[PDB]
Amino acid sequence: MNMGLFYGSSTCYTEMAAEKIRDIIGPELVTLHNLKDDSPKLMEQYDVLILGIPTWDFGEIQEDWEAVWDQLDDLNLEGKIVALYGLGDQLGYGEWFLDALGMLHDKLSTKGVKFVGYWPTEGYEFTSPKPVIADGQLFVGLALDETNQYDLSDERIQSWCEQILNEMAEHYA
Ligand SMILES: Cc1cc2nc3c(=O)[nH]c(=O)nc-3n(C[C@H](O)[C@H](O)[C@H](O)COP(=O)(O)O)c2cc1C
């Protein structure tokens, strides 16, 4: 299946993660979409999607994601696989770490999607109630930080990619 990597970035952080995800999984079948210029309507075509939101200004969404957040309700995503990923920082926040991630998860759960890319919350710092499932033991998506985890965020992407490329494919078997 062809898969759509969607993101929005004010700087470059979500962009660099996007390149990595598509690269690791396979640019044969993954395609980047830069929502600060691309319309999310093309996300209706692709069988499977991977969507990435940075949490800005204390639990705000990145400003270019806010621009398409309106259309996401109108789109056809019903029965699509979605892997969420998100960016923030633990040291300055924790409380607002991945807050936008929880918001897309609650957005796209109403869109009748199926989700991949959970991680266990152990060995991380957040204590926020939003980006978590089960009993709060696993995150809704890949969680990154570029303010101090910049040394390892790269390694966490690839390992996340190594599961989502199974979770999506094994669903589709
Ligand atoms: C003014 C400002 C506010 C931020 N607000 C949050 C926040 O609410 N939660 C969080 O965990 N990180 C926060 N961050 C960290 C960013 O989410 C993080 O750097 C992210 O990678 C931004 O991605 P982007 O620039 O590609 O859009 C903030 C950063 C700045 C500069």
CATH of the domain at 94: 3.40.50.360
* CA 49/CA 133 separation, integer angstroms: 20
| DSSP code at position 45 | T
Q: For residues 54 and 9, what is the distance between their CA atoms, to the nearest angstrom?
A: 7
* Centroid of ligand 1 to alpha carbon of 155 (angstroms): 20
CA of 149 relative to ligand 1 center, distance in Å: 13
Q: Could you list the beta-strand ranges (E) of 67-154.
A: 81-88, 114-116, 119-120, 132-133, 138-139, 142-145
Specify whether the CB–CB gap between 84 and 70 falls below 8 A: no
Give the residues across from 6 on adjacent strands: 33, 51
| CA nearest to 144, candidates 124, 162, 127, 129 | 124
Tell me if 87 CB under 6 Å of ligand 1: yes
Compute, in angstroms, the gap from residue 10 CA to the centroid of ligand 1: 10
Number of domains in the chain: 1
Which residue lies with its CA nearest to atom 17 of ligand 1?
88
What are the structure tokens assigned to 46, written together? 């692709």
Confirm if 13 and 146 have CB atoms less than 8 A apart.
Answer: yes
Beta carbon of 62 within 6 Å of any ligand 1 atom? yes
Instruction: Say which experimental method was used.
Output: NMR
Measured CA distances, 124 to 83, 85, 102, 108, 134 (Å)? 20, 15, 16, 25, 17
Q: Are 127 and 71 in contact (CB under 8 A)?
A: no
With beta carbons less than 8 A apart as the criterion, state whether 53 and 8 touch: yes
Cα dist from 120 to 36, 138, 155, 161, 169, whole Å: 31, 4, 16, 15, 21
Q: Could you tell me the residue range of the domain that residue 36 belongs to?
A: 1-173
Quote the ligand 1 centre to 11 CA distance (angstroms): 10
